Amino acid sequence: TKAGSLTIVGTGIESIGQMTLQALSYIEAAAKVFYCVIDPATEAFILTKNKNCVDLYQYYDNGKSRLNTYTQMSELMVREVRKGLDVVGVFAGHPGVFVNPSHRALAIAKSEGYRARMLPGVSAEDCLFADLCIDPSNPGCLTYEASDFLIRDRPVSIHSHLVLFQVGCVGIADFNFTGFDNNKFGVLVDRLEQEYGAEHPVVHYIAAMMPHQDPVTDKYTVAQLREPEIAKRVGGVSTFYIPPKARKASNLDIIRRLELLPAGQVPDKKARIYPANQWEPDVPEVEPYRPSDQAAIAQLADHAPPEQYQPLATSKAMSDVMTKLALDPKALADYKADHRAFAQSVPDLTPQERAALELGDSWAIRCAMKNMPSSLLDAARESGEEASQNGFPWVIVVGVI
Amino acid sequence: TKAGSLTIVGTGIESIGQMTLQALSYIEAAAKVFYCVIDPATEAFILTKNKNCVDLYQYYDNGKSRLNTYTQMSELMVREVRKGLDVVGVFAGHPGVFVNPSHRALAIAKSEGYRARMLPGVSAEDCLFADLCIDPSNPGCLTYEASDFLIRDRPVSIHSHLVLFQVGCVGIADFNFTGFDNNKFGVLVDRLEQEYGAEHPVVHYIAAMMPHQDPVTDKYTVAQLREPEIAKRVGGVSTFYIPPKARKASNLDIIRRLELLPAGQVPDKKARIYPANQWEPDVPEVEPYRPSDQAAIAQLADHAPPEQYQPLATSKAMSDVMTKLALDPKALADYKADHRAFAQSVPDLTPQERAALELGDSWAIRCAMKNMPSSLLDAARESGEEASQNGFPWVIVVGVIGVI
Ligand SMILES: C[S@@+](CC[C@H](N)C(=O)[O-])C[C@H]1O[C@@H](n2cnc3c(N)ncnc32)[C@H](O)[C@@H]1O
Ligand SMILES: C[S@@+](CC[C@H](N)C(=O)[O-])C[C@H]1O[C@@H](n2cnc3c(N)ncnc32)[C@H](O)[C@@H]1O
């Protein structure tokens, strides 16, 4: 309903490959691209994909306040939005994770009535989970900016994951082309010593930024971070992962109210699902092949799909259109403008496929692309009111479930 | 050296478009693909990219324990790894975020001496930050699985973001094709009432799973979650976001030790950097264009890049090879095996480009791809240290920083 749009997208952390297909598609479709990325291969890639790019990094300077820079970056984007253009902003990682100017620009554009969207990307924390072989679900995850962690005295949980961004320049972090002096690093180490003890592990993590490099996953004690040669390794792309120090016990009241007792008691609080977190101090070895695991594996020989399983049964024409809607922003905009008129223009759809697309309905799309068996709908009819998507994947964190 | 590998990748949350370029490239290059995705368009897309796919979802069944299913899913992948094949596992979102079988399979493969890697993807939490317009950095973020949150009595912080996954089946969540019965949801609501009060907002979040659908971003009070017509909207793809109830003050000792002085007038604890979190209750309106913002904008007219700014200055041949290494897993494997032989096979590189690639050094690559000015290297050489990457982007969360 008004000309002009702002879409902010991420590149991910590792050069080129961690960009999403949709982020690429918006970069190619844009009238104007504004980017801020440290990696030159990623910068070069972006410039091959759009003819009208501006490097936002040129608005930093020595002794020029970051906030003034962020104001300038956002204003450069919003000015093009105001002139009626489809503008794309590009930042490293996930563009809304530990980033100032993306949020500012989107809020401004939205407040003046323009279309404004952030697209998610792969963050440094996403990379951390992948490279350290941890899951934030087990046993929960606290994530802070290191200076904020200190200044606001943010609480830690010794029973959960802790991730600290921006450990490489605690306190004042004035822009400087020839680098930070992390002269207040000891204030962070002090806090870590108070919370965890001098012998507790801290993992220095740096995701590889090129496809070929290995990640830095260096474990140190809190005490070792005081050594000058170790402290010097922590720079502007360093993140700290602090593993839990202990395992939290279960709450008897909740166990009862959730009916997890079979007139009997749960797994011991250290009776872990394989694999254990390898960074956790004094982590005991967990057996991957218990008798129950071996029995489950034995059943694979006799396995067939359950009668309620819904095999995919689609067509080239339908997969092509669903792919086009995900990868062509213009096609998506058109479809959202008028489901019918779009659905009518698509070649080679069956009547069901056309109808489902026209209708705007997840269930219709599912039926069009999956063979739904009688035993599923008979069970969905005999119990309840109407059928929908069910049978969800689900992480088990507590041993009982 | 040992034959066989396992790479586990994500699809992201929204159909197709949230898969990474590298996830796609590994799916295409794999000898065998094992996938577990709910979205049929994503399943169809995967099947068009590799000829040898297996749907892991078929190993679920009614009243069959999920742990047994996960054991089976892992074992199917690891069997093909032990046979010396390049195997790819595909799960929704980020394949290591709230997922059991990926971690099991990788840990087994790795313990038996096979190459094993997880590639990150876009999670439902990444989607949540983007759709709710929040930054986990401001003012920190706590993330839990809902049943674990309750059973282990995990702490909340009323001053930070809280994100809860799997709110649609609190407690026993046995597999059922016709869906969960969320009859213990009240146990979660009681906990939220105790921690936050009955009138505090909870945001029911469901990311759009078709490119065209819109996100669900519905704000309710904790009390409203007890209404049957509201509680029934919560399902298997629901996540809750609970915004902070208050702003935390600064610590005077830390202010001093970090030298964020003088006078005793740091920014007030509610003096926010624009924009404010719109979900936070009684959030005061923040001014986007303060006098200093207007002055910064006035300087745009006379702006030129500083002396130390490094323009990109590369070639078609160099951007091509760097792109190939990011997008072609075979090409990358060759390059890592022998930098020199790979770099000498590459057509049309200049001597420096060739040389930088032979070395495998971030800094050599940067010099080959950017024009480094004298002002920058004269500053590095005056220090007595070789130049490296500096001038990092940095989020400002504490308002005192940025005022200095
Ligand atoms: C201003 S933030 C930007 C984060 C980015 N938007 C993201 O999605 O992660 C900079 C901080 O992110 C983290 N970071 C950036 N690159 C990284 C890397 N290669 N490895 C580990 N952490 C990184 C560090 O904590 C760094 O100080
Ligand atoms: C087994 S987990 C898997 C998460 C996935 N690996 C990821 O990266 O987010 C399932 C939970 O993820 C969250 N989730 C999955 N799809 C979602 C969506 N479309 N919107 C919001 N949350 C979602 C919900 O909390 C759901 O209960």
Residue numbers in the entry:
A (entry chain A): 7 to 407
B (entry chain B): 7 to 410
Please quote the paper that reports this structure.
While chemical methylation of an amide bond uses a strong base to generate the imidate, OphA, the precursor protein of the fungal peptide macrocycle omphalotin A, self-hypermethylates amides at pH 7 using S-adenosyl methionine (SAM) as cofactor. Here, we report the structure of the peptide amide methyltransferase OphA including complexes with cofactor [SAM and S-adenosyl homocysteine (SAH)], cofactor analog, substrate, and product.
Mutants Y63F, Y66F, Y76F, R72A, R72K, Y98A, Y98F, Q172A, and W400A of OphAΔC6 were expressed in E. coli. Y76F, R72A, R72K, and Y98A were unmethylated even after 3 days of overexpression in E. coli. During prolonged (12 days) incubation, there was some evidence for a very small amount of methylation in the Y98A mutant (>100-fold reduced in vitro activity), but not in the Y76F mutant. Tyr98 has plausible (but not ideal) Flippin-Lodge (−19°) and Bürgi-Dunitz (149°) angles. However, it is 5.5 Å from the carbonyl, its tetrahedral intermediate would create multiple clashes (with SAM, the side chain at position i and the main chain at position i−1), and no base is positioned to deprotonate it, leading us to exclude this mechanism.
